[PDB]
């Protein structure tokens, strides 16, 4: 529908992967209807985080929240040239909810500093 080409490099390192109409309530129609609703729900579910973090229309957006070393103690050579995006998630999956809240407020405080900056 979109693409599973992102998934091509699921075993590659993090540095390599990153670099008709009419509705009929038949058993297949109800099946194919929820698939259409379940797609736009899961799509906007991710797309509203990108918007609220100030990253809509971006694939790679840099933030302003420093990397708290308690989230991971590994080196940049141990991450981007060793771990895969699939296993790196399992190591950091505890702090993902703790990180998503910091990127959410780093964008919020950046917005009020701009409304004071452009007022000159």
């Amino acid at each position, epitope marked *: 529908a979109v693409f599973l080409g992102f998934l091509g490099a699921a075993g590659s390192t993090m540095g390599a992967a990153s670099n008709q109409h009419l509705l009929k309530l038949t058993v297949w129609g109800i099946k194919q209807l929820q698939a259409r609703v379940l797609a736009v729900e899961r799509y906007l579910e991710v797309q509203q985080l990108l918007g609220i973090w100030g990253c809509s229309g971006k694939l790679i957006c840099c933030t302003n929240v420093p990397w708290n070393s308690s989230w991971s103690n590994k080196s940049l050579d141990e991450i981007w*040239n*060793n771990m895969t995006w699939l296993q790196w998630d399992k190591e950091i999956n505890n702090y993902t909810q703790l990180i998503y809240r910091l990127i959410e407020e780093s964008q919020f405080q950046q917005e009020i500093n701009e409304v004071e900056l452009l007022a000159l």
Partner: nanobody
Amino acid sequence: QGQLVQSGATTTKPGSSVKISCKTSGYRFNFYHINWIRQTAGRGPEWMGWISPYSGDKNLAPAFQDRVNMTTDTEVPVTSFTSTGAAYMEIRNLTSDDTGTYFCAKGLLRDGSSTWLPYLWGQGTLLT
């Protein structure tokens, strides 16, 4: 983690062609190079060569260019990131100069400048 248990400390006589095994545990066997380095009793530590358990590519030392046969059988998957492979290595016209402890070590990373660097060493097999 990971452990690269080696073969047995078997000693033959000059002219033989002993094989040394090196089976791994606790890590993806295909994701890292295997490396063999000996420590001759009358020489400095000598690097012999590495092979890629994934690509199947070899690169050895000039002093072992036509004297060493090293191979690897495929890995037996255990989980999404653990495998159980094995690494074998032979010598051709073996003499008494090849006497010493032999080591097998796995690569440092799987990308970058120091990809194959012998990071995790095994246990050692004493020869003739």
